[PDB]
Symmetry: D2
Subunit: 359 residues, 4 copies
C-alpha cells in the first residue's frame, strides 16, 4: 500500500537521538540527569541536551520545554551528507511534508531534514553533528546504573504490515515479529545497525511513541536503576520489569518520566547484521514472548504512549487500530495465553499470568 | 503465653536442613538436581540427599518419598553434643512431644531430637553429622545458577507475636518485622547465624511451611534460574520475582517444586550479628516492603503453603488466623498500599500495584 | 605500496570462522568443548565444527587434525553471493594466488574463495552457509563461562602501515592504534561490523596468527573461565589477564590451547559503525594502553604466535620485523613506560610494571 | 609460649574499625572518600571518620593526621560492656601495657580499652558506640565500586604458631593456613564472626600491619575500582589483583593509599560459623594458594607493610622473622612453586 519510490533510499546508520517536548524542564532534568545519570552536553532555560556514556555525537536526547508533552523528532544518522539529499527526494516521492534546515533544528546538529513520514511520525535525518568528548573510559564518572548507548525507538501504529513494508523499502530488516494464526501482525522489530532493532512497530492507535530505549553494559546496572528508584521512593514510576524479553532476548526495564514518556533500559540482545539473519515469529498467545519468565504485561504498556508532533509543532491526530488488540487477545475477557503450546496446564483463559486480572 | 522454661535453651548455630516429603521421587529429582543443580550426597529409591555448593555437613535437603507431600522436619544444628540434651530438657518442660534417636532419623545425621513444637512444627536439633567434600572451589562443577548455601526457613503461623516470643526465648533475635498502626503483626524475621534470618514467621493459617531458601553468590545467578526455567518451558513454576526485597534487602526469586513446595533463591542480605543490631519495622501498607521496586505480590504467595507432619507422619491440623490478613489489607478489594506515606499519587486502593487486580 | 585495485572491493560483513589445524583432535576437543563449552555442529575423526551460543551460521571454529598446528583459514562472510566474485576479481588484480570452490572447503560453507593475501595470510570469503539452530535462548545449555559470539582475529605482521592501507582499501576502518613519537606504528585495529575490530595487526615477525577472540555476555563469565581452569589445575594455560584493555575498553582474558593457539575471551567494547568514528591513538610507552590497570604484559604475549598455512597447506615463511619492537621499547633492557605522561613517579625503566 | 590467662577472654564479636595515622589529611580524604567512596561519619581538620555502606556503628576507619604514617589501633567490638572489663583483666594478666578511657579514644566510641598486645600490636576493645544511619538501602548513594562492610585485618608477625595460639586463646578459630612439609607455618587466618577471618597472621618482620580489608557485594564492584583508578591515572597504586584467592576463595584486589597503607577489597568467601568447620592447609609451594589462577605475587606484597604505634604514639620496634620466608621459598633464587604437585610442567624455579 505505501509504494516503493524509484528514488534510492538514504543509507541510514542507526537511531541517533530523540527530541522530546517536556512541560517542566527542571523536573525532567532531575529525572534524566539526577536519577538516570545521562551526561549534559548543553543546557539552557529552554532545552537540555543529554548523551549516553559511550556516545561521541553531540547528544542522544534533547529535552525541549513546551506546552504539550510529545515526541518532536526521532532522529536517524545517515552515512553521508548526500544521504540527507537522498532522504528529501525519497520522502517527497512518497508525498510527505518535509523541512530542510542547513544549520539544524537543534544545537549540535548541522544540515538536517525533518519529515512527516507516511505513518504520521516526525523523523529527522542528518549526517553533520558536533563531536564531543566520548566518555567511554571515564570510569571516574561511571554510575552504578550507567546508560551507555541509545539503542532504539518503538512506535505505536494501527496497521503493522503497512508500516513494515515501508520500513523494509527504506532498508530496515525485520528481525522478530509477533503474529497469530489468523493473519494478524501485532508487532515487528527492524534494524539498520546490526542489533535486534533501531525502531519497532507496536500495533495500536497512533501515531504515538511507545518508548525510547537506552542500553547498559550488564544486568546488574538495570537492577541498580530499580534499586535507586526504590531509594528515591519513586518506585511508582517503574512501569514494568525488570525482565528478560522473549523477543530480542534482552534484559529490560520500563520506567516513566515526569511527562509519562516511557523509557526502556535494555541490555544483551544479539547480532543481526547478516542479511539472511533468521526472522523469528512468536505467536501472540505465547506467554513467554514479551517476558520470557511469564510475568504479566501491565495493561498500561499496551494502552499508554506519547503524543507525536507534526512539523508545525501541533499534535498528530490519532487513528484507531481496527486489527485485533494484543491486550484483548491475551489478557482480556476473551483472552488466552499458554506456557507450552497445546498444554492446558500453564495456560490462562481470560486473565493475565501469575494470578492477576486486568484492573 | 508460651512460658520461658527454667531449663537452659540449646545453643543453635543455624538452620541446617529440611526433610520434605515428595510424591514422585524422580520428578522431584529432575527439579532439584537437573533444573536447580543441587549436589547429591546419597540417594536410593526412597530418598535423595542434597547439598549446596559450599556445604560440608552431609546435606541441606532430604527428599523422602511418601503419600502426602509435606514438611517432615526442619533441622537446626546446635553447637555441641550436650546441646541436644539441652533441647530435650527444654521441650520436655514446655510439655511438647519429643523423640530422640541416638543413631539419627535420616542418613548422615547422628544423635538427634525431633519435637512437635508449641506452634505445631516438627523441629529437629542435632550436632553430629557426616562431613562430605566441601565443593566451594569446584568450579568445574559450578552452574550458571549455582545454589551455594541453605539460608533459612519461613513458617506460616496464625499468631505472630506468640511465636516470636517463643523463638526469642530459644535465642533467636528479631531483625525485621511488618506491622500496622493499630498493633497487628503480619511477619517477623529472626536469626542465630548473623544474617537477617534462619527462620521467619508469616501470619496465616498454620502450621504450614511457607518456603525453604537457598543463596547464590550473585544476582545474575538468580536471573539464570529464571532464564533456564523459560528455556525448559516451565515458567509457570516461577511464582514470584525476581526482585529486591524491602525487608532483608536481598535479591530474590520464588519457585515451586513438583509437589508445590515453595523454594526461595536469595542473595545479599546484611550482617546482623551485633547484639544491638538495629531492628527495622515496616508498615504493612508500604508497597516497597516486600518488593522494593513496588511489584505486586502474587496472591498465591499469601494463600498457599505446605502441609507439615507430626512425629507419627500425620498432617498437623490447621488453625485459622483471626488477626488481619496481609493480602486483604494491601491488595484485596478493600486493601491499600502506598509508595510514599501520606501521598495519594503512587497509592493503590482495592487492587495491586502496577495495574493488576486479583485474578 | 600494496596498490588499490580498480576492481570494486567485496562488501565484507564480519569475521565468521577460523579453521585451525591441531595435532591431537581428542585433546583439542577436551579444551574447546569440555573446558570452554563451545557447541558441536558436526564432528568426525578428522574435524570438529564448533559454534558459539548466539551463532546461526554453521560454525565459528573448525578444528582440523593435521601434522603441523597452524591457522589454515581466517574466514569473513560477505554480503551477497556476487561479493565472492568481487573478492575473486579483487585479489586477482592484487596478483594474489586464489582458489574458488563452489561447494566450499569445509562442511557447512557453500561457494567460497580462499586467497594468500598480500601479507601472507590465508583469507576466505563466502556467503552461502548452512543455517543451524541458534542457541541464544537455550539457557538449559548455558555455561557459567558461556562464549556467545566470535569477535575477531589478530594477525602478526612486520610492517603495520603497509597492512593498514591494504585493509582500508578492502573497506576496514581503523578504530584504534599504537604509535610512538618517532613515526613507528606498533598495532592497529580495524572493523567492518561496527565493533572495535574484526581483525587487527600486531607488529612483529610474520605472517603469524596472534589469536582468535570470542565474546561473553558479562565480565563474570570471563572470571568463571579462570576459576574453572584453577579447579582443573590448568592455570598454567592462562597466559595473560583477566584485565581491562586500554585499546578497545574491553574486559579480556588470554588462554592457550593444547597446540599453543592463543584464544582471547573478550566482552564489552563500544560501537564504531559511524563513518567518522573518532580514531584513538595510544603512545606505545603508555602503561595503561594494553592493560588499563597497568598490569605487565608477559613477554610470551609479544613473542609467541601461531604459524599460518598457504593454500597448499604448507607453513608460510616468517619475515622479520625491522621496525622497533613493542616488547623492547616498553619492557626490554632499555624499555620505558609511564603511568602519567611526564611524571617520573609511576614510570618503569628497563622492566615491566608491578615489581 | 604466650600463656593463657585464668581470667576469662572477652567475647569478641568482630573486627570493627582501624585508626590509621596519615601525613596529609586532604590527600587521604581524596583517596578514601573521592576514590573509594566511603561515607563520612564526622570530620574536622585533624581527623576523618568513615564507614561502609551497610555499617550502623559510628565508623569503620578513622584517619588521624600525624607526623608518621602508621596503624594507631585495630579495634574489635565485644559483646557486652562487661567484656571491656574482661579484656582489661585479661591483658593485665598477660603483663601487657593497657589504657582504659571511659569516654573512648576517638569520637563515636564509648568505654574502650587499648593495649600493646603480646605481638606488639595496638588492639582496642569496646562495646559502646554511637549508632548512625545504616545506609544499606540508600541506593541513591551507592557507587559502582561500593564498599559494603569492613571484613578483616592482616598482621605481619615473625612467629605464626606463637601468635596463632594467643589468638585461639582469645576465641579466634583458624579456618585456613599455609605450611610446608618441613613443618613451617607461613600464614594463618582466623575468625570470630563466621567468615574466613577477622584477623590473619602473615609470617614476616613485625609488628607491621599488612592490610585492612573491605568487602563489596559483587565481583564487578571490584573491577570498577580498578577501572576508576585507571581513569584517574593512579593505576600505579594498584598493587596486586584483581584475582581469585586460593585461601578463602574470595575475589580480591590490593591497592595502596597515599601513605602506602595497603587496602584489600574482598568479596564472596564462605561460612565458617560451625565449630567443627573443616580447616584447610595449603602447601607453600602450591602456585594456586594465593592467587587461584596462578598469577605471580609481586615481591612488594611480601616485604612492605605499615608501621604500628605503641600507646604513646611511638613506632613499635620490629623483630625480624627467623623462620623460612614465603617469598624466599617460592620466588627467591632457591624457591619454587608448582601448578600440579609432582609435575615439572607448570612449575617455576627461581622465578
Ligand atoms: O520482603 N519479603 O517478601 C521477604 C523478605 C525476605 C524473605 O526471605 C522473604 O521470604 C520475604
Ligand atoms: O589492548 N590490547 O592488548 C588489545 C586490545 C584489544 C584486543 O582484542 C587485544 O587482543 C589486544
Ligand atoms: O590467598 N591469600 O593471598 C590471601 C587470602 C585471603 C586474604 O584476605 C588475603 O589478604 C590473602
Ligand atoms: Ca487464533
Ligand atoms: Cl515486550
Ligand atoms: Fe523496546
Ligand atoms: Fe524468605
Ligand atoms: Fe584481541
Ligand atoms: Fe586479606
Amino acid at each position: 500500500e505505501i509504494p516503493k519510490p524509484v528514488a534510492p533510499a538514504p543509507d541510514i546508520l542507526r537511531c541517533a537521538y530523540a527530541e522530546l517536548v517536556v512541560t517542566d524542564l527542571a523536573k525532567s532534568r532531575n529525572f534524566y540527569v539526577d536519577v538516570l545519570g545521562l551526561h549534559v552536553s548543553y543546557e539552557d532555560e529552554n532545552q537540555i541536551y543529554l548523551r549516553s556514556f559511550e556516545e561521541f555525537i553531540h547528544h542522544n536526547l534533547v529535552l525541549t520545554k513546551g506546552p504539550v508533552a510529545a515526541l518532536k523528532a526521532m532522529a536517524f544518522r545517515v552515512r553521508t551528507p548526500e544521504d540527507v539529499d537522498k532522504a528529501e527526494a525519497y520522502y517527497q516521492e512518497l508525498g510527505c511534508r518535509t523541512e530542510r534546515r542547513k544549520d539544524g533544528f537543534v544545537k549540535g546538529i548541522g544540515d538536517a531534514l525533518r519529515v512527516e513520514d507516511p505513518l504520521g511520525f516526525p523523523y529527522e535525518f542528518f549526517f553533520e553533528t558536533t563531536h564531543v568528548e566520548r566518555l567511554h573510559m571515564r570510569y571516574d564518572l561511571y554510575s552504578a546504573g550507567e546508560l551507555v548507548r541509545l539503542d532504539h525507538f518503538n512506535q505505536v501504529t494501527p496497521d503493522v504490515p503497512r508500516g513494515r513494508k515501508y520500513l523494509e523499502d527504506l532498508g530496515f530488516r525485520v528481525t522478530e515479529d509477533i503474529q497469530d494464526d489468523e493473519g494478524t501482525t501485532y508487532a515487528a522489530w527492524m534494524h539498520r545497525k546490526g542489533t535486534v532493532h533501531d525502531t519497532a512497530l507496536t500495533g495500536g492507535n497512533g501515531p504515538r511513541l511507545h518508548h525510547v530505549a537506552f542500553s547498559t553494559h550488564e544486568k546488574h546496572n538495570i537492577i541498580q536503576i530499580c534499586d535507586k528508584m526504590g531509594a528515591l521512593r519513586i518506585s511508582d514510576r517503574i512501569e514494568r520489569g525488570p525482565g528478560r524479553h522473549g523477543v530480542s532476548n534482552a534484559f529490560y526495564l520500563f520506567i516513566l518520566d515526569p511527562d509519562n514518556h516511557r523509557i526502556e533500559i535494555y541490555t544483551q540482545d544479539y547480532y543481526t547484521g547478516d542479511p539472511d539473519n533468521p526472522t523469528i515469529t512468536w505467536n501472540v498467545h505465547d506467554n513467554q514472548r514479551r517476558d520470557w519468565w511469564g510475568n504479566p504485561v501491565v495493561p498500561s504498556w499496551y494502552t499508554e504512549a506519547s503524543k507525536v508532533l507534526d512539523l508545525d509543532g501541533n499534535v498528530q491526530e490519532i487513528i484507531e487500530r481496527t486489527d485485533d488488540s494484543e491486550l484483548e487477545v491475551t489478557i482480556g475477557a476473551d483472552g488466552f495465553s499458554f506456557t507450552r503450546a497445546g498444554d492446558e496446564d500453564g495456560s490462562y483463559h481470560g486473565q493475565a499470568s501469575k494470578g492477576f486480572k486486568l484492573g
